[PDB]
Amino acid sequence: KMITPRFSITQDEEFIFLKIFISNIRFSAVGLEIIIQENMIIFHLSPYYLRLRFPHELIDDERSTAQYDSKDECINVKVAKLNKNEYFEDLDLPTKLLA
């Protein structure tokens, strides 16, 4: 009833781009929880659960976006960095970003 999904993360100067791999889910008006707060992201789409801690802060605002991709079978989550141009280290070591 909780699974820790495969995920991966890249960035540019404004955003981090989280890619969360999921199988056999159903969306609804209320099934998806995403909390973004300082350096934390929590994603809950039962059974799937991620709680991630980043090396710097993000900010939830109008720019936050999440889109399901059926070819890739993932939700692509795009969150803004609290500071433009700030580098986030070690995003290629997903295993470490677990809170």
Count of structural domains within the chain: 1
Q: In 6-29, which positions are buried (b, 16+ CB within 10 angstroms) versus exposed (e)?
A: ebebebeeebbebbbebeeeeeee
SS3 for 34-91 is EEEECCEEEEEECCEEEEEECCCCEECCCCCEEEEECCCCEEEEEEEECCCCCCCCCC
β-partners of residue 8 are 19
Q: Print the domain residue range for 48.
A: 1-99
Tokens 């300082």 -> residue: 38
Q: Method of determination?
A: X-ray
CATH number for the domain including 52? 2.60.40.790
Sheet with 33-37, strands from edge to edge, namely: 33-37, 40-45, 48-53
**Using the 8-state DSSP alphabet, how is residue 7 labeled?**
E
59 vs 63: CA distance, rounded Å: 9
Cα–Cα distance between 60 and 9 in angstroms, integer? 17
* Length of the chain counted residue by residue: 99
* CA separation for the pair 65, 75 (Å, rounded): 10
